[PDB]
């Protein structure tokens, strides 16, 4: 009667003519915060955020129909190129801003660049413009999507494998995202819920190429708090035990992800950037390539303080730029998030869902079906 289209050109709103939007997963605290789901308080404080609630859910609602698509869609043979280009298309036309004038990527739409991160590179790879790669058979790729409306970012990311021997890989970070996920709520410690990210991901091992490689947490990535156009707040959510006391309070915004690798553990940064976002916290700098100043326009008005990629500069029409930016990097304007990488040889994989801490109950807003 009324459904999505292959790829998501239908707008979400049609779909839900009331205008309201499907909550996630909706889980009571526990214990000594369970009183908050029938407290008449929490839920009237609750309830003055209706219009939060229900724009972080729109824009929850695109990413699972977006990333349904993907999941259909990817395989061995695809490009890169391609994939990014569907997403993002399916991305902006569901929420209903092409994101060309200025101002209206601000309004909805990429919360920041595709994730599509192969093998040993565990994130932040996108690919340029002229990017010819394309997906093996033998490819783990992490697919994080982020989708925000007004300002409300959901960041949810999945693994995709077509060779069978990687599964157990998938099984244990998948597994190792959904318990730190439980373990979260009002009063919990984040360095305790790292501790059990790891005992659950470390219980798991997978045999490739005949050798035996226990999965290991990648202990120098963490989740995050999300705060209004911005992906990173002040507060993280270690994968391995840490004495990090920080507490999640009501009202927080959380990215749970974790990350599980048959190498080290642990990632650097190597390869071609694509991903950069400008920083609220610039200093003042006196910018005397003329080019730095029009692209830092270019930036504040089309992506404010949202994560971009190159591509989404050069759809703007941006062909000079790259002297520019890297400008605004060496002067701490614009920050570069390079691809990260761990051993080469190895494979990674990574699960993440957004949490909202609502005074009432916890809510996983990016839960689906798939997971
Ligand atoms: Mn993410
Ligand atoms: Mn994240």
Redesign the pocket.
């Known amino acids: 009667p009324t459904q999505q289209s292959d790829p998501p050109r239908v707008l979400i709103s049609h779909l839900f003519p009331d205008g309201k939007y499907p909550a996630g997963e909706e889980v009571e605290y526990v214990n000594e915060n369970r009183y908050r789901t029938t407290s008449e308080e929490k839920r009237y404080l609750d309830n003055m955020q209706s219009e939060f609630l229900n724009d972080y859910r729109q824009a929850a609602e695109v990413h699972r129909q977006v990333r349904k698509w993907a999941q259909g869609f990817v395989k061995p043979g695809k490009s890169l190129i391609e994939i990014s280009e569907g997403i993002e298309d399916s991305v902006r036309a569901l929420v209903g801003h092409p994101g060309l004038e200025e101002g209206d990527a601000l309004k909805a739409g990429m919360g920041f660049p595709v994730?599509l991160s192969i093998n040993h590179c565990a994130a932040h790879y996108n690919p340029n413009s002229g990017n010819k790669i394309v997906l093996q058979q033998d490819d783990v790729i992490k697919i994080?999507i982020?989708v925000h409306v007004n300002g409300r970012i959901v960041?949810?990311?999945f693994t995709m494998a077509w060779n069978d021997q990687f599964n157990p890989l998938l099984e244990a970070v998948r597994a190792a995202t959904n318990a730190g996920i439980r373990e979260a709520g009002i009063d919990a410690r984040v360095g305790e819920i790292g501790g059990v990210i790891q005992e659950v991901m470390e219980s798991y091992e997978v045999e490739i190429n005949g050798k035996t490689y226990p999965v290991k947490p990648i202990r120098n990535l963490n989740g995050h708090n999300i705060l209004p156009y911005s992906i990173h707040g002040t507060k993280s959510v270690p994968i391995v035990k840490t004495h990090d006391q920080t507490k999640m309070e009501e009202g927080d915004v959380f990215?749970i992800?974790t990350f599980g690798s048959t190498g080290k553990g642990y990632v650097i940064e190597s390869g071609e950037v694509s991903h950069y976002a400008l920083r609220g916290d610039a200093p003042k700098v006196d910018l005397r390539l003329s080019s730095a100043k029009s692209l830092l326009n270019v930036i504040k008005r089309h992506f404010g303080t949202l994560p971009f990629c190159r591509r989404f500069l050069d759809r703007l029409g941006q062909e000079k730029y790259l002297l520019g930016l890297n400008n605004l990097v060496s002067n701490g304007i614009v920050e570069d998030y390079p691809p990260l990488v761990d051993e080469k040889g190895s494979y990674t994989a990574q699960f993440?869902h957004t949490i909202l801490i609502r005074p009432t109950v916890k809510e996983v807003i990016s839960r689906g079906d798939d997971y």
């Open positions: 994730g994080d982020g960041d949810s990311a990215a992800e993440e």
